[PDB]
């Protein structure tokens, strides 16, 4: 109900006010067969990332929720998801037109957590690596998130 | 020291130059570009599958009377 209202206008405030169950409320709310829809969810969540433990964990958990419920479906193509992610992050071109996004800080932080998670499809790592390495102004606009994610990806 | 040269474009244009063996190809390219109405950086020239130079002469490139040069319109993947 109000979970819906959060997704259209994401804030670190709105997210916390969904209470302790938010990760599940999110994971249920979204269609987890559809990479594009999972991507849309994932970004909306990651956007509100802050480095302070409450919001951090409330994001990281919500991502873990969403992503574990996708990768376990055979109905979910990881490569399509990763591809569609890259396109929305603006790292890869697409035939369709997407509104791309100012800050990659959150997405990057979210990704940094998701990758060292067990449920993560390790075969996706090198791909993700190649587009994080690839020059991008926006990637440059948070160097630290980028670098700590790269550093995580090297370890696999 | 008077030879013929055929320049053959991807559009199936055929432009035949007469020219002397000691003469550097840069003039020919220029003349061809001008005649075909296209820019010299936008177009590339090749002999025997291999690129050709401003410096290059039919002498250097061991060219024959009825021989042929190929033109390539620039393009790039995206």
């Amino acid at each position: 109900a109000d979970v819906s209202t959060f997704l259209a206008f994401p804030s670190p405030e709105k997210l916390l006010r969904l209470g302790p169950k938010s990760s599940v409320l999110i994971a249920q709310q979204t269609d987890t067969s559809d990479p594009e829809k999972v991507v849309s969810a994932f970004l909306k969540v990651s956007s509100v990332f802050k480095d302070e433990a409450t919001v951090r964990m409330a994001v990281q958990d919500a991502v873990d929720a969403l992503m574990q419920k996708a990768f376990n479906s055979s109905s979910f193509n990881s490569n399509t998801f990763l591809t569609r992610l890259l396109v929305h992050m603006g790292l890869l071109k697409s035939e369709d037109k997407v509104k791309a996004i100012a800050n990659l800080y959150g997405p990057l932080m979210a990704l940094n957590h998701m990758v060292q998670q067990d449920y993560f499809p390790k075969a996706l790592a090198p791909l993700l690596l190649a587009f994080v390495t690839k020059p991008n102004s926006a990637l440059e606009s948070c160097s630290f998130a980028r670098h700590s994610l790269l550093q995580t990806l090297y370890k696999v | 020291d008077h030879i013929n040269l055929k320049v053959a474009g991807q559009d199936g244009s055929v432009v035949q130059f007469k020219i002397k063996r000691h003469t550097p190809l840069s003039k020919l390219m220029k003349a061809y570009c001008e005649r075909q109405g296209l820019s010299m950086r936008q177009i590339r020239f090749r002999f025997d599958g291999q690129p050709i130079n401003e410096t290059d002469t039919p002498a250097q490139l061991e060219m024959e009377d009825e021989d042929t040069i190929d033109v390539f319109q620039q393009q790039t993947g995206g």
Binding site: - | N4, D11, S13, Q16, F17, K18, I19, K27
Partner: protein, 65 residues
């Protein structure tokens, strides 16, 4: 008194030129009609893709002809 000269270029007939122009094609496009071996007829073309591929007999490139 100069060196490099254009002695020849492939040229179409006035009617062939007009057609290319109308169709925004290269001027030389219809010059194949000027060949000696050209027959102004070809049959009605029913011929499917699969057939054309087969017709290649797996030979993609050239050789001593």
């Amino acid at each position: 008194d100069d060196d490099v000269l254009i002695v020849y270029e492939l040229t179409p007939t006035a009617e062939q030129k007009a057609l290319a122009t109308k169709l925004k094609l290269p001027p030389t496009f219809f010059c194949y009609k000027n060949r000696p071996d050209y027959v102004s007829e070809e049959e009605e073309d029913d011929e499917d893709f699969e057939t054309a591929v087969k017709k290649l007999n797996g030979k993609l490139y050239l050789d001593g002809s």
